[PDB]
Design a protein around this nucleic acid. Structure first.
Ligand code: MG
Ligand code: ZN
Ligand code: ZN
Lengths: 1285, 72, 97, 49, 50
DNA sequence: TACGGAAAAATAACACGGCGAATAC
DNA sequence: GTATTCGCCGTGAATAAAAAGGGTA
RNA sequence: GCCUUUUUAUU
């Protein structure tokens, strides 16, 4: 099959699926386990329960395949044929479908142009409709005697089916087509544009409206709801057939009208409870108080087929046990147990036994395995000598959770997961029990060796740093070697080479760390020099490859230092000398850690003598602050900020006093003067290396742990004065748990949110596959690193690392189609230029994917991204992976740089200050080399001490402003005249000071009159709640103040990726022009801009509690905020631009990513917003086919536009819509991929009424339908499939 | 084998390497096809990758070997 | 718990859970995305069809591994046929082309 | 939750929309829950179950 | 906070159009008068509740 | 050997966005 | 006609073990 | 031969 078409079930199509008709409500017989005639499990209707055995017991021995008997009529067949054959029931009354009824919007409600409330009153027999208008039961007795001969009315779904039979599809669509062309409505147009979209999609899929109302209801096959020695579905099916049989008992005896309306309602409620649960008048519960599982409850949610049985299928030839260290084995190897791998490779044993000829059958080969003799293990090691085996963690919130290995047979039922990939799994050896998998066939084993092996998984897909990072022990063995000590054994002796240092240390006459001179041979060709190298660093030179330099080895080699040592070996040496180098790091870092003896103890770290004096000073410092509060010197808020000020300064004073007692404490007499050298404490060796302890973790260990947080978010006033070495107090440990149990409740609850964020990120980005090599488009975004902070954290070295540029930047410097390598990115760093135009993901215009050169580098391989790789899945897995890592004033230019102001119409002031006039100002600290390092967005009203275009020295205050009061600044100088500014009506004066009244609390005498201030030209208007200190008759300058106007992490990733509006959205300006005040007597301020060439009647809606950023006297610009606060993701796309929203979502996700310390590349978020920009709202139809009000995909309007550019008619433009990770994953094509995410009761009704025959594109679709993935080597199969079709 | 970086530099794309090694493994399993590499005790997964280590098996020259078997 | 072949579930043709039920390891929706991230198209097609879904395939695979041939055949997954009958049991038409 | 009068509040950004909220919960040992919740429209509304 | 001034037998206690401090609370307690003069527009903003 | 479902249960009562429906101005 | 609040509705990680319960007289 | 709830426990 190549496509799956979904539509409405016809009454003839339901009977075409069913081979028989069921009439019995009871499932089977009560006495024996044999089904009755015309039952739910009957063999005549569906098929026999045994393999080639009739129900009576006469036709056996497999001598027939399609015989039909005459005694019982049972068509004997296989057991799996019973899983396919279905049944149907003939209902006495029609029944409305509950999925199409309770959906939002209602499919039955939009056809009958009724809301949800009245469309269910006629269905459950409370009201009547005609065959329209809705009349109740008490209006039906008067309708038969007044208009009874003109119109006829019924109730239930029979009247709904008769009304859908009366209306026509072409007649109702014509009446709605002429209504949308002439209407001045926005909210009413939204209700009508979804109704005509429902009608226009019926004629394209050829679905009648009467097919939605079910006259015939199909049932499941009996193997789909099997009885067991009582289920949660067959008892629910007994609720429907009992109601179906009772309605057949009412027609023959001429039942009255009162009893048939109640029986049809319970028949309608039985189908409403069968096909759905939770969307009715009352959800049906079982006998044991649990909610009963309906047909919808077993298709949606975690317990549905889409998540438990189509995405969560259990896997044979696959086991699960805890993981171990296993230091003796190689990187591509692990450890599989003897009796476990024998049970996993059980047909692999049977294949090798029949190949050699030991057991040439399947029966005696099972006896050879279960006997466990000596010849079974020699067969087993030949199979598992080079067989790849997938090691798999049960939570995989990352790409590296599934890695292949080449295991060896060991004792013990635990797997020996490799320590080098232990940081790649992000899972320590804390007793975690996790799965294991094998590939059976040879085309799947090569996928494990070429892609899933641990050898070629060195670099992380998230960042340029390798994911193979030595975490705790191998880095500790490396750190004890690479150290310098005076007065050591064998100090100041010559060595012939690096291999002689192994002879020097294993004999025991010299220490592991001694300042000597070893001869080394460095490569790129061989150079030799006698440099200062200790004994431990000389062990490393036999471990590193030839071409690795020495300048990366000569440091202390901590965890942060050897992260680049593994990266430089991948860069210039290649992958083939990386696997041997990484294994020999793990061989040396483990074996020398045994010889190291780096431990933890009470004699290792020591409480410094300055700690007991600092705590005695801090307890004496809080005594005078508390005595000042009793006398009344400070307030409650000023005292609370002062205690944390003097304790965090004491926490930083005890941090440095404890650090020097671990850095330069223990000294040894080196035959002379007592010199200050680095201490050899094992706690500092685990702290300077950054292996397992940070600078703040040892601060909590030997010193006081500092300020702890409250559960609501505040800080404890009195922190822990003691430390963990001498023990805490009872209350000190109790307030220590206020941040520890809170952080662990933060950890155990954000994994349910980041796990939901992992599903939300993949399900919207699974359609995006790289499909082209080169397209030819020069469109892209402008790249700028983080500048708003004081110090640069992520520069342009790691920002544009491995991304092909769109347009060639200047100092011809770089080409266009050339990928930026590690040498090309360093060429951009030495030039010190910014504003690089690179090819972005949202700028590529291809079908169901992006180009390979428009993406960049994979950052997991050394070359470019391969054509046919899941490019949206590798990024969405590296977004939820830091989700469980993060938690759920004046200016002072410290650095040196020349100031620069953009889009500022600065004028002269009275004192010569660089006064600003625009709202959106951004400072640029341009250096002498040509780049910038610092930036600040100062508010409107900041007085700059110096102008623009000169150098600003470091440590000098350049500006100052007031954040609480917003002033107003004119443009030119001149006399001031109070135009329309009178007192008594709208201006009162409080004592020497003037103030304008608020628009809400003012009287009814000055509501129409608005104040103004014109020059004597430009007119300046002031808003309410302002203080005017200027009197009439005083000459003022341009920069003088005229009106004083006074006033976590994972939710930020969740709110921004869903493209939702926050609690304080920032309003943007549509057309640059003149903004007025607004209109009163409305309850909310409205914004209107009437420029010369703009749109006049456009109006906004601003609440009264919000304030206006820009003034109504100054000219507004497109891209200036009206409300202060966080910018809304929907308004930055529609107004500022398409390339502006992809810069805002990335830089704000990366803003909260730097607070935790994780490094995620910017292109990984850029492939998510491309799957958020793939839905668009077309602004004009023109020569196109679909309606303007209809919202379709960007991939559908881009191929249709290229067809128009080849023709004579022009192409219709479109406006993109930022549908989030929840919105765009549902309202899209490939309905199989949308039904697995969520809203299976809704999006399957959205696809049945609209056709939506998917073209087998997408990754979630091919997983559920079970065929080759179009984002691997199956893309080459899909490439040949397009060549076949 | 240990690493696949020497076989991927002959073909380029990684997903094209799996397609040519799977078709080489099908010939070594059912239809004879003794390899030109020295045969060792390892399985046919490594033999499908050892032939691309020196470059005697490629995706372009494996299709002309399938047509050569069809002419005989 | 290790399972090569054993008793399957009666609702859908899939393995079971627990060591007492021979220990069929559940893959899960989180591990499908980690398998398709590398581009393992032949492995992900095996992991949810030949292991569980293909009842006509897992017996032909079990006759193929004991023969000595590691060849995977494309088949119609019966676990999707479990899903195909669930939508066909409602008033929604769905077919294959 | 103990049976009695519970005065709750959700400040910050949880169902606030720029205003503080005060909901009073009278819960029994058994029966129907009685709630008195506010709104951004500044009108006391009663909630039962 | 009211825009008008509250008088009691020719004694001005609350200034018109100005927020008073806490000094007028204790000063008013010693000379409690049960009748003051109020304009007609201040009562129209209230509810009658009877 | 029969009906499967209703009203009482001396029921269990969450939280953060979202979509459509019933009002105030 | 235009918002506006709200009733109901989407979602709330993943993975192993034990227990009852599988309609009521 | 199972399935679904609930509880405990693990990452
Ligand atoms: Mg763990
Ligand atoms: Zn028979
Ligand atoms: Zn492109």
């Amino acid at each position: 099959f190549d496509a799956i078409k979904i539509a409405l079930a016809s009454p003839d199509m339901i009977r075409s699926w069913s081979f028989g008709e069921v009439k019995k409500p009871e499932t089977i017989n009560y006495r024996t386990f044999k089904p009755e005639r015309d039952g739910l499990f009957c063999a005549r209707i569906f098929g026999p329960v045994k393999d080639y055995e009739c129900l009576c017991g006469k036709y056996k021995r497999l001598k027939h395949r399609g015989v039909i008997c005459e005694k019982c009529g049972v068509e004997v067949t296989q057991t799996k044929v019973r899983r396919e054959r279905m049944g149907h029931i003939e209902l006495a009354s029609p029944t409305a479908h509950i999925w199409f009824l309770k959906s939002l919007p209602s499919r039955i409600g939009l056809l009958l142009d009724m809301p949800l409330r009245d469309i269910e009153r006629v269905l459950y027999f409370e009201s009547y409709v005609v065959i329209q208008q809705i009349l109740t039961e008490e209006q039906y007795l008067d309708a038969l005697e007044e208009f009874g001969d003109e119109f006829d009315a019924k109730m239930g779904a029979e009247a709904i089916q008769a009304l859908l039979k009366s209306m026509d599809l072409e007649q109702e669509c014509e009446q709605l087509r002429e209504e949308l062309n002439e209407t001045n409505s926005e909210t009413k147009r939204k209700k009508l544009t979804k109704r005509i979209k429902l009608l226009e999609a019926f004629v394209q899929s050829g679905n009648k409206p009467e097919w939605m109302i079910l006259t015939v209801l199909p049932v499941l096959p009996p193997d789909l709801r099997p009885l067991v020695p009582t289920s949660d579905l067959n008892d629910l099916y007994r609720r429907v057939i009992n109601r179906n049989n009772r309605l057949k008992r009412l027609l023959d005896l001429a039942a009255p009208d009162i009893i048939v309306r109640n029986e049809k309602r319970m028949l309608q409620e039985a189908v409403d409870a069968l096909l759905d649960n939770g969307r009715r008048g009352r959800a049906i519960t079982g006998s044991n108080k649990r909610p009963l599982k309906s047909l919808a409850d077993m298709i949606k949610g975690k317990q549905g087929r889409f998540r438990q049985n189509l995405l969560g299928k259990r896997v044979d030839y696959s086991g699960r046990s805890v993981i171990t260290v296993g230091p003796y084995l190689r990187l591509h190897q692990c450890g599989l147990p003897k009796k476990m791998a024998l049970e996993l490779f059980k047909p692999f044993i049977y294949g090798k036994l029949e190949l050699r000829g030991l057991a040439t059958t399947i029966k005696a080969a099972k006896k050879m395995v279960e006997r466990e003799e000596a010849v079974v293990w020699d067969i087993l090691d030949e199979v598992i000598r080079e067989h790849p085996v997938l090691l798999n963690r049960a939570p995989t919130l990352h790409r590296l959770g599934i890695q292949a290995f080449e295991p060896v047979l060991i004792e013990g039922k635990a797997i020996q997961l490799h320590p080098l990939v232990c940081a790649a799994y992000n899972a320590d050896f804390d007793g975690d029990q996790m799965a294991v998998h094998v590939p059976l066939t040879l085309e799947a084993q090569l996928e494990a060796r070429a892609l899933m092996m641990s050898t070629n998984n060195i670099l992380s897909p998230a960042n340029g740093e390798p994911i193979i990072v030595p975490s705790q022990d191998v880095v500790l063995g490396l750190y004890y070697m690479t150290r310098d000590c005076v007065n050591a054994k064998g100090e100041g002796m010559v060595l012939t080479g690096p291999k002689e240092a192994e002879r020097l240390y294993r004999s025991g006459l010299a220490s592991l760390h001694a300042r000597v001179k070893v001869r080394i041979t460095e490569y790129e060709v061989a150079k030799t020099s006698l440099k200062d190298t200790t004994v431990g660093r000389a062990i490393l030179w036999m471990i590193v490859p030839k071409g690795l330099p020495y300048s990366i080895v000569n440091q202390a080699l901590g965890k942060k230092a050897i992260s680049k040592m593994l990266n430089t070996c991948y860069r210039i040496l290649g992958l083939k000398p990386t696997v041997i180098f990484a294994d020999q790091i793990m061989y040396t870092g483990f074996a020398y850690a045994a010889r190291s003896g780096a431990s933890v103890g009470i004699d290792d770290m020591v409480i410094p003598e300055k700690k007991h004096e600092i705590i005695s000073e801090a307890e004496a410092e809080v005594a005078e602050i508390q005595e000042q509060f009793q006398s009344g010197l400070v307030t409650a808020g000023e005292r609370y900020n002062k205690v944390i000020d003097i304790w965090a300064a004491a926490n930083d004073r005890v941090s440095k006093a404890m650090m020097d007692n671990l850095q330069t404490e223990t000294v040894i007499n080196r035959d002379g003067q007592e010199e200050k050298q680095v201490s050899f404490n094992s706690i500092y060796m685990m702290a300077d290396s950054g292996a397992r302890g940070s600078a703040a973790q040892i601060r909590q260990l030997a010193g006081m742990r500092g300020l702890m947080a409250k559960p609501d978010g505040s800080i404890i006033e009195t922190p822990i004065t003691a430390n963990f070495r001498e023990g805490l107090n009872v209350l000190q440990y109790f307030i220590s748990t206020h941040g520890a149990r809170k952080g662990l409740a933060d950890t155990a609850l954000k994994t349910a949110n980041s796990g939901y964020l992992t599903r939300r990120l993949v399900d919207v980005a699974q359609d995006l596959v790289v499909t082209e090599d080169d397209c030819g488009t020069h469109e892209g975004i402008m790249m700028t690193p983080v500048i708003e902070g004081g110090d640069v954290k992520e520069p342009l070295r790691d920002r544009v690392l491995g991304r092909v540029t769109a347009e060639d930047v200047l100092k011809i410097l770089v080409p266009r189609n050339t990928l930026l390598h590690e040498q090309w990115c360093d060429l951009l760093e030495e030039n010190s230029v910014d504003a690089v135009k690179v090819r972005s993901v949202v700028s590529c215009d291809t079908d169901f994917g992006v180009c390979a050169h428009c993406y960049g580098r994979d950052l997991a391989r050394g070359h470019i991204i391969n054509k046919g790789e899941a490019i949206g899945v590798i990024a969405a897995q590296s977004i939820g992976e830091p989700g469980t890592q993060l938690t759920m004033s004046s200016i002072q230019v410290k650095n040196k740089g020349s100031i620069k102001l953009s889009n500022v119409k600065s004028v002269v002031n009275s004192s010569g200050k660089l006064v600003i006039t625009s709202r959106n100002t951004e400072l640029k600290l341009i250096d002498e080399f040509g780049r910038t390092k610092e930036s600040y967005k100062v508010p409107y009203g900041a007085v700059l001490a110096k102008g623009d275009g000169e150098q600003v020295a470091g440590g000098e205050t350049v500006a100052n402003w007031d954040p609480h009061t917003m002033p107003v600044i004119t443009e030119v100088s001149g006399f001031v005249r109070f135009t329309d500014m009178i007192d008594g009506q709208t201006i009162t004066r409080q004592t020497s000071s003037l103030v304008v009244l608020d628009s809400a609390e003012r009287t009814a005498g000055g509501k129409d009159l608005r104040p103004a201030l014109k020059i004597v030209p430009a007119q300046y208007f002031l808003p309410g709640k302002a203080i005017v200190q200027l009197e009439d008759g005083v000459q003022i300058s341009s920069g003088d103040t005229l009106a004083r106007i006074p006033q976590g992490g994972l939710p930020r990733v969740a709110d921004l990726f869903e493209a939702r509006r926050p609690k304080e959205p920032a309003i943007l300006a549509e057309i640059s022009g003149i903004v007025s005040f607004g209109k009163e007597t409305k309850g909310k301020r409205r914004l209107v801009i009437t420029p010369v060439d703009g749109s006049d009647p456009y109006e906004e809606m601003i609440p009264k509690w919000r304030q206006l950023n820009v003034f109504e006297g100054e000219r507004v610009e497109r891209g200036d905020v009206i409300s202060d606060g966080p910018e809304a993701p929907h308004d930055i796309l529609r107004l500022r631009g398409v390339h502006a929203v992809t810069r805002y979502i990335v830089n704000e996700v990366q803003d909260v990513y730097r607070l935790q310390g994780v490094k995620i590349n910017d292109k990984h978020i850029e492939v998510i917003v491309r799957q958020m920009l793939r839905k668009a709202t077309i602004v004009n139809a023109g020569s196109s086919d679909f309606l303007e009000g209809e919202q379709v995909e960007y991939s559908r309007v881009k191929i249709a536009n290229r067809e128009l550019e080849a023709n004579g008619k022009v192409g219709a433009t479109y406006s993109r819509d930022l549908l989030g990770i929840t919105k765009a994953s549902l309202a899209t094509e490939s309905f199989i991929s949308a039904a697995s995410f969520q809203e299976t009761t809704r999006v399957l009704t959205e696809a049945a009424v609209a056709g939506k025959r998917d073209e087998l594109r997408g990754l979630k679709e091919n997983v559920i339908v079970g065929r080759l993935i179009p984002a691997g080597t199956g893309y080459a199969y899909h490439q040949d499939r397009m060549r076949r079709r | 084998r240990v690493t696949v970086q020497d076989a991927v530099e002959k073909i380029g794309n990684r997903f094209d390497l799996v397609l040519v090694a799977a078709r080489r493994a099908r010939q070594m399993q059912v239809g004879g096809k003794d390899p030109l590499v020295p045969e060792e005790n390892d399985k046919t997964t490594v033999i499908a990758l050892r032939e691309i280590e020196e470059g005697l098996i490629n995706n372009q020259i494996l299709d002309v070997r399938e047509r050569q078997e069809q002419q005989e | 718990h290790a399972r090569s072949t054993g008793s399957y579930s009666l609702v859908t043709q899939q393995p079971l859970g627990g060591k007492a039920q021979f220990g069929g390891q559940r893959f899960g929706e989180m591990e499908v995305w980690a398998l398709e991230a590398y581009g393992a198209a032949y492995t992900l097609q095996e992991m949810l069809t030949v292991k569980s879904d293909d009842v006509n395939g897992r017996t032909k695979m079990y006759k193929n591994i004991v023969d000595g041939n590691h060849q995977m055949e494309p088949g119609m997954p019966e676990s999707f046929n479990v899903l195909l009958k669930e939508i066909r049991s409602l008033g929604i038409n769905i077919e294959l082309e | 939750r103990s049976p009695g009068v519970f005065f709750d509040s959700d400040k910050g950004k949880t169902h606030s929309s720029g205003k503080v909220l005060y909901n009073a919960r009278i819960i029994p040992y058994r029966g129907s829950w009685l709630d008195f919740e506010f709104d951004p429209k500044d009108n006391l509304f009663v909630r039962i179950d | 906070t009211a825009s008008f001034d509250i008088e009691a037998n020719g004694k001005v206690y609350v200034e018109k159009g100005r927020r008073i401090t806490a000094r007028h609370i204790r000063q008013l307690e010693k000379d409690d008068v049960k009748l003051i003069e109020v304009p007609v527009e201040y009562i129209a903003g209230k509810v009658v509740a009877k």
